[model samples]
Target: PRYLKGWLEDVVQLSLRRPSVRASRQRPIISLNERILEFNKRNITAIIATYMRKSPWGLDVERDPIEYAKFMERYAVGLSICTEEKYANGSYETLRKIASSVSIPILMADFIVKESQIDDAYNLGADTVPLIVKILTERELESLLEYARSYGMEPIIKINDENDLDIALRIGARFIGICSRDWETLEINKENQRKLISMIPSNVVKVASTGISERNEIEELRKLGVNAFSIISSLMRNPEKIKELIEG
Candidate 1:
């Protein structure tokens, strides 16, 4: 069950090897079950609607498994880990042990450009997998999400704007990520962030990420009905603050 596919270097190798096969070019086979669709439609809608109204959900990811575990031991927030298709060595097992021990949901934050990646995520013990909508066509996105749901894993679609939200919905994704930082510039786009977040419907769970710092900001997001928030730099700066902010 625990197997390593490639090293970090392999990721670069693969990315360089495949120029014609862009991430957007991937088209998944859509296989939907009517019962499953109805079940998920009801279940996910309820979870998203209810959670967003209460508090901002915790989100973070592991760049290095051991270091992340150490951080989580003190921080105690939901953590995610990404597996590069090129570098098959992300300490997934380490993350899994920590997730089980801590009793928090662990998301598999990977660039799922193919269906095989979904299989890899579940086998490696991830509760969710982030599917980037911008990288895939509407049809492809739906196909991937339907496949992920079929395996009992929730699919979180990452969006940069309101347009992506529509795509996320059309693609059958219940969880949506709204990042403040521009993916290309890595700069904070506050206007776009707020604008994009405003577009989230009350039914779908809105997860805000990037450029979020300070406990007050989190509280503010909670007031906005954002259910989930993901952070990396803040934790990197002061991992201990994770507990301080969440517990207090």
Candidate 2:
């Protein structure tokens, strides 16, 4: 239960150039889930999304997928590949190539609606996949979660609102992402994120996605109980922030 708080404190101490603060009086060794441990080991809990083409949001940088993967290798704990045709030209093939080139885990972050896409993502070397809770029916979401897990891939249930968050937890999602950006309007709301983060159970690995652009923002979110972050535009523009946040 203290894993999220403990990890955040660990990073905060490092940022302030202070000695590592013990998370508890008993000093219990927090048992983190495998996904949490994967990010924690690097001391960088941020995952960067690689955008192969430009977008109206101006967050995505036009870069070669392999080059982006190599660039992220030094800074990010994991990589997110958007296979949606609107974002990338090569789609699944691009994901496959990037996965082959990167040593870090790859998460396919497309509008994955079908169960078949889960299988496809796993075969493409994706360690994880995202399922939008706002769009999918309960039966469909549960089926996709089961399918993804059956192939040794983790399913990140993306929640856009309070109702979605409740649904995600009801489905027993281990990895849950509280998105700050609105899907339809593309608006960012940190207040919504703070409220949602407070509602998540400690047993689940809570990831904050979208709208995080600075180390201070991460610190604030960490204070609100978020374990990790999924950063995009801000990180692509200022890669130095990665080192500053993780190794400071």
Candidate 3:
């Protein structure tokens, strides 16, 4: 209870200092593109992805939304909400609640394939949406990116290989992620992760997603010029690690 009390006090201080929506929008919230650039300048960006589950009754009971919001307010530079259709109990209402509860930007993680889905994400309060390159054609990809921009939401193109990487670069993807796990096989390959990171240009916002389980791996990736990381399981299991990694 002592530790929890201290943590709550920290959250209260943060809330008091956080800017209001009107005040923040007067200057306007920083787009994901700009936020990533700022993070690169600072040299440390911890993007925490919340993986909450719904019960048979459809309530998001596994992960307390309020607690997740406080966690983001305390430590994360950015937040990625998993609205992935399969096994996702997170609703647009949940997304809205979380977004309004915190001042940080949020990225809606979904298997977005159509332009309409982009609009849906934007309307639901996503500052950014992920476009999985493996699942989209070049034509579809370009149109979706353009549409997302038109709606004021940044698009993060996710890649699993060099081919996807080449296409993402060709399409002028400003924020690109190299996921270490295969979407199809779901295998974790740290070596492949390193190889892909080595190939990315220094100018692009290079984010390593998935398979990051320890602080040492993050430190190693940071040395490789990777600007950000999207971590879930590790942080959810031990939220205190967020402070240690960010401060380290």
The prediction achieving the highest TM-score against the true structure is 3
> lDDT by residue for model 3 over 95-137, one digit each (tens)?
6677777777788766666655565566656788887777667
Q: lDDT of candidate 2 vs native?
A: 0.68
lDDT string for model 2 (108-137, tens) is 766666666665666667778887776667
**Residue pairs clashing, model 3:** 25-28
RMSD score of candidate 1 (Å): 10.6
Q: How far in Å is the alpha carbon of 86 misplaced in model 1?
A: 6.4
- Decoy 3 TM-score against native: 0.81
Question: In model 2, which regions exceed 4 Å deviation?
Answer: 1-35, 41-45, 87-90
Greater-lDDT candidate between 1 and 3: 3
- Over 4 Å off in model 1, which ranges? 1-64, 70-77, 85-102
Model 1 Cα displacement at 117 (Å)? 0.5
Q: Which of 2 and 3 is the better model by lDDT?
A: 3
